Design a protein around this ligand. Structure first.
Ligand SMILES: CN(C)CCC=C1c2ccccc2CCc2ccccc21
Length: 170
């Protein structure tokens, strides 16, 4: 069953435990042009999830590299458990994404606009800044499911990261 993992899955405390920690933004692709535009500029990103299960929020410490600068932000994501989504209002708009999983327990994906063939996309994250060819195939196989060509994928370059020195300064 190839595209079974693109179906929404409710978020439990176990799910929240699973995503607790440091993750690295690996790659994404979208049919939505706004997200293509903003995500293009991303050279690298790592981040921390610290869920508050009682509040259905996730504390986010984000370390983004664009134009060879480090942009650091903290904020809370809201969790909508039945729907398997997480959200965050930012720069005017509410953003929502489905939390989706691959077979590799060391990776995760966020799904944007999943209900819309004109706008859908997937972003891929791993617990290392570099991914194995196995992890990357599971991600491509999820793109294949959304009929998004592999050549549309935007990648981070862990060579380009400027945030390590701030995260340690923290
Ligand atoms: C282009 N982006 C927005 C694609 C979705 C990715 C995420 C995400 C994932 C991991 C760490 C931080 C963020 C921040 C942004 C945000 C806001 C709401 C829901 C999901 C998301």
């Amino acid at each position: 069953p190839l595209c079974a993992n693109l179906v929404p899955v409710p978020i439990t405390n176990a799910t929240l435990d699973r995503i607790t920690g440091k993750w690295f933004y690996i790659a994404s692709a979208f049919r939505n042009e706004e997200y293509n535009k903003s995500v293009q500029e991303i050279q690298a990103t790592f981040f921390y999830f610290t869920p508050n299960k009682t509040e259905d929020t996730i504390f986010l410490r984000e370390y983004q590299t664009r134009q060879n600068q480090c942009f650091y932000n903290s904020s809370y994501l809201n969790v909508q458990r039945e729907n398997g989504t997480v959200s965050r209002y930012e720069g005017g708009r509410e953003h929502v994404a489905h939390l989706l999983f691959l077979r590799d327990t060391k990776t995760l994906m966020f799904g944007s606009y999943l209900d819309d063939e004109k706008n859908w996309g997937l972003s891929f994250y791993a617990d290392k800044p570099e991914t194995t060819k196995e992890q990357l195939g599971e991600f491509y196989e999820a793109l294949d499911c959304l009929r998004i060509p592999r050549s549309d994928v935007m990648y981070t370059d862990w060579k380009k990261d400027k945030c390590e020195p701030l995260e340690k300064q923290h």
